[PDB]
Enzyme design. Structure first.
Site, mmCIF file in Angstrom:
data_model
loop_
_atom_site.group_PDB
_atom_site.id
_atom_site.type_symbol
_atom_site.label_atom_id
_atom_site.label_comp_id
_atom_site.label_asym_id
_atom_site.label_seq_id
_atom_site.Cartn_x
_atom_site.Cartn_y
_atom_site.Cartn_z
ATOM 1 N N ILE A 66 0.803 -1.140 -0.028
ATOM 2 C CA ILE A 66 0.064 0.051 -0.040
ATOM 3 C C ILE A 66 0.865 1.320 -0.119
ATOM 4 O O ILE A 66 0.374 2.413 -0.271
ATOM 5 C CB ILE A 66 -1.069 0.094 1.182
ATOM 6 N N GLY A 67 2.297 1.037 0.149
ATOM 7 C CA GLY A 67 3.004 2.302 0.100
ATOM 8 C C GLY A 67 4.503 2.098 -0.073
ATOM 9 O O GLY A 67 4.871 0.838 -0.026
ATOM 10 N N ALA A 68 5.250 3.150 0.334
ATOM 11 C CA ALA A 68 6.800 2.886 0.301
ATOM 12 C C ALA A 68 7.229 3.800 1.187
ATOM 13 O O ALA A 68 6.722 4.829 1.537
ATOM 14 C CB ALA A 68 7.365 3.333 -0.813
ATOM 15 N N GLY A 69 8.155 3.167 2.195
ATOM 16 C CA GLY A 69 8.839 3.893 3.275
ATOM 17 C C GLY A 69 10.192 4.096 2.791
ATOM 18 O O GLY A 69 10.685 3.676 1.764
ATOM 19 N N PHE B 135 12.776 2.665 3.854
ATOM 20 C CA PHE B 135 13.708 1.384 3.764
ATOM 21 C C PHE B 135 13.109 0.304 3.189
ATOM 22 O O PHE B 135 13.632 -0.795 2.984
ATOM 23 C CB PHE B 135 13.964 1.005 5.245
ATOM 24 N N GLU C 56 8.963 -1.525 1.526
ATOM 25 C CA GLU C 56 7.467 -1.332 1.470
ATOM 26 C C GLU C 56 6.808 -1.175 2.734
ATOM 27 O O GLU C 56 7.167 -1.433 3.894
ATOM 28 C CB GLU C 56 7.095 -2.664 0.687
ATOM 29 N N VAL C 57 5.484 -0.545 2.412
ATOM 30 C CA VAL C 57 4.437 -0.624 3.570
ATOM 31 C C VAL C 57 3.527 -1.369 2.980
ATOM 32 O O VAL C 57 2.893 -1.295 1.798
ATOM 33 C CB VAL C 57 3.892 0.951 3.980
ATOM 34 N N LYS D 103 5.704 -2.799 7.842
ATOM 35 C CA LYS D 103 6.893 -2.210 7.114
ATOM 36 C C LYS D 103 7.961 -3.235 6.987
ATOM 37 O O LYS D 103 8.054 -4.155 7.931
ATOM 38 C CB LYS D 103 7.620 -1.017 7.818
ATOM 39 N N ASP E 20 9.207 16.426 13.446
ATOM 40 C CA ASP E 20 8.886 16.529 11.963
ATOM 41 C C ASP E 20 7.198 16.567 11.966
ATOM 42 O O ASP E 20 6.689 15.627 11.182
ATOM 43 C CB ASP E 20 9.471 15.435 11.215
ATOM 44 N N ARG F 204 1.522 15.001 6.539
ATOM 45 C CA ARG F 204 1.921 13.768 6.043
ATOM 46 C C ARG F 204 2.233 12.971 7.097
ATOM 47 O O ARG F 204 2.396 11.530 6.730
ATOM 48 C CB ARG F 204 3.190 14.125 5.158
ATOM 49 N N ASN F 205 2.780 13.179 8.206
ATOM 50 C CA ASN F 205 2.844 12.363 9.542
ATOM 51 C C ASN F 205 1.777 11.964 10.423
ATOM 52 O O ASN F 205 1.902 11.351 11.220
ATOM 53 C CB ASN F 205 4.233 12.821 9.928
ATOM 54 N N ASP G 179 5.503 8.572 12.748
ATOM 55 C CA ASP G 179 6.985 9.116 12.238
ATOM 56 C C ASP G 179 7.796 9.310 13.538
ATOM 57 O O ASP G 179 7.868 10.467 14.040
ATOM 58 C CB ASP G 179 7.159 10.255 11.365
HETATM 59 N N1 LIG Z 1 -5.378 4.362 2.587
HETATM 60 S S1 LIG Z 1 -4.467 3.044 2.258
HETATM 61 O O1 LIG Z 1 -4.975 1.945 2.776
HETATM 62 O O2 LIG Z 1 -4.022 3.150 0.689
HETATM 63 C C1 LIG Z 1 -2.932 3.075 3.113
HETATM 64 C C2 LIG Z 1 -1.633 3.377 2.565
HETATM 65 C C3 LIG Z 1 -0.529 3.719 3.210
HETATM 66 C C4 LIG Z 1 -0.804 3.444 4.589
HETATM 67 C C5 LIG Z 1 -1.953 3.139 4.999
HETATM 68 N N2 LIG Z 1 -2.012 3.122 6.523
HETATM 69 C C6 LIG Z 1 -1.120 2.816 7.725
HETATM 70 N N3 LIG Z 1 -1.533 2.400 8.668
HETATM 71 C C7 LIG Z 1 -0.529 2.225 9.763
HETATM 72 C C8 LIG Z 1 0.799 2.723 9.583
HETATM 73 C C9 LIG Z 1 1.230 3.126 8.332
HETATM 74 N N4 LIG Z 1 2.660 3.246 7.995
HETATM 75 C C10 LIG Z 1 3.568 3.282 8.989
HETATM 76 C C11 LIG Z 1 4.179 4.190 9.441
HETATM 77 CL CL1 LIG Z 1 3.546 5.883 8.930
HETATM 78 C C12 LIG Z 1 5.489 3.993 10.482
HETATM 79 C C13 LIG Z 1 5.661 2.682 10.979
HETATM 80 C C14 LIG Z 1 5.040 1.715 10.216
HETATM 81 C C15 LIG Z 1 4.006 1.809 9.269
HETATM 82 O O3 LIG Z 1 3.291 0.618 8.988
HETATM 83 C C16 LIG Z 1 3.726 -0.328 9.927
HETATM 84 O O4 LIG Z 1 4.776 0.276 10.493
HETATM 85 N N5 LIG Z 1 0.248 3.066 7.289
HETATM 86 C C17 LIG Z 1 -3.072 3.219 4.396
HETATM 87 MG MG LIG Z 2 10.871 12.227 12.419
HETATM 88 MG MG LIG Z 3 10.407 12.193 9.160
HETATM 89 MG MG LIG Z 4 13.108 9.863 8.997
#
Ligand SMILES: NS(=O)(=O)c1cccc(Nc2nccc(Nc3c(Cl)ccc4c3OCO4)n2)c1
Ligand SMILES: [Mg+2]
Ligand SMILES: [Mg+2]
Ligand SMILES: [Mg+2]
Ligand SMILES: [Mg+2]
Length: 274
Positions: free
Chosen positions: A14-17, A19, A21-22, A40, A133, A137-138, A151
């Site tokens: 669902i995303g990219a961090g 280091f 994938e998310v 992550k 930060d 976005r966070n 974050d």
């Molecule tokens: N609306 S959607 O379903 O497309 C979507 C897209 C990206 C992230 C979502 N939720 C989303 N929910 C919880 C956390 C997260 N990102 C995340 C962070 Cl910011 C920090 C640490 C971590 C993370 O995932 C597990 O470990 N993301 C939901």
């Molecule tokens: Mg930070």
């Molecule tokens: Mg940051």
């Molecule tokens: Mg950082």
């Protein structure tokens, strides 16, 4: 908390961090009902320092417990990929969520979002944790529109370390923090005023196309962002309070939460707009 990898099922990327994938997934542990998690992952090819930095976010999250702070479920560290599991926030990042939904949530809803963020920050400040930060976005948003701070990391910004954490986020950062690198809960209150602006503008970019140096110079020269379209003047004023040049004059987060709670209780006050 180390999670047996057999308890985790990854459903979708669902995303990219920074280091890796998310992902969205499912966590099912003995004696507990299954739950949805964000995951992550860290795969092959990073240094040990990078592994530590990746896992540091988990260490920090795991120190906190608050409904407006992203909840850590656990980590997978005795297996590849390395993983961090958190609660899943269905609507993702607040800035993008609001841009998708431009003009589609009421002022009271927006203020409730702001209140949740401010409550998260109230807690972090109580815990002597400076975010550094704080930006829309966070902020992550769940299906019930509850906003939670994300974050976490304690690494110094690149400007703080050797002459030769990433860069200071200039547009969100308080002037004394930029100038002197003194990050405090009071510099976070500045950032919080910027988040307020981002929220009431439905995710517009703070300072539009101004360069980072343009922003630094403008703020030193008394410029402050104007009220977003349709923004209640009382909210803009709280923004201005957060953006006082003298950090000691800014509201602390308990005061921010109080102000927002008053607004919710007294919605008529939100009708005055420039
Ligand atoms: N609306 S959607 O379903 O497309 C979507 C897209 C990206 C992230 C979502 N939720 C989303 N929910 C919880 C956390 C997260 N990102 C995340 C962070 Cl910011 C920090 C640490 C971590 C993370 O995932 C597990 O470990 N993301 C939901
Ligand atoms: Mg930070
Ligand atoms: Mg940051
Ligand atoms: Mg950082
Ligand atoms: Mg607009």
């Amino acid at each position: 908390k180390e999670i047996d990898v057999s308890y985790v099922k990854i459903e979708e990327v669902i995303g990219a961090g920074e280091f890796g994938e998310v992902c969205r997934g499912r966590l099912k542990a003995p004696g507990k009902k299954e739950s949805c998690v964000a995951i992550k992952t860290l795969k092959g090819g990073y240094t040990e320092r990078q592994r530590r930095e990746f896992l540091s976010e988990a260490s920090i999250m795991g120190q906190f417990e608050h409904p407006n702070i992203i909840r850590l479920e656990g980590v997978v560290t005795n297996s590849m990929p390395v993983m961090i599991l958190t609660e899943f926030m269905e609507n993702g990042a607040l800035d993008s969520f609001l841009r998708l939904n431009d003009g589609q949530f009421t002022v009271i809803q927006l203020v409730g979002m702001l209140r949740g963020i401010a409550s998260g920050m109230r807690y972090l400040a109580e815990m002597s944790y400076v975010h550094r930060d704080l930006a829309a976005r966070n902020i992550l948003v769940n299906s019930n529109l509850v906003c939670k701070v994300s974050d976490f990391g304690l690494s110094r910004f690149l400007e703080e370390n050797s002459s030769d954490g990433g860069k200071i986020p200039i547009r969100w950062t308080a002037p004394e923090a930029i100038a002197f690198r003194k990050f405090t809960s009071a510099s976070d209150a500045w950032s919080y005023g910027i988040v307020m602006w981002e929220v009431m503008s439905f995710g517009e970019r703070p300072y539009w196309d101004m360069s980072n140096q343009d922003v630094i110079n403008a703020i030193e020269q008394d410029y402050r962002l104007p009220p977003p379209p349709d923004c209640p003047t009382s909210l803009h004023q709280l923004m201005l309070d957060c953006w006082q040049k003298d950090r000691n004059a800014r509201p602390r987060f308990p005061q921010v939460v109080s102000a927002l709670d008053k607004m919710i209780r007294n919605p008529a006050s939100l009708k005055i707009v420039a």
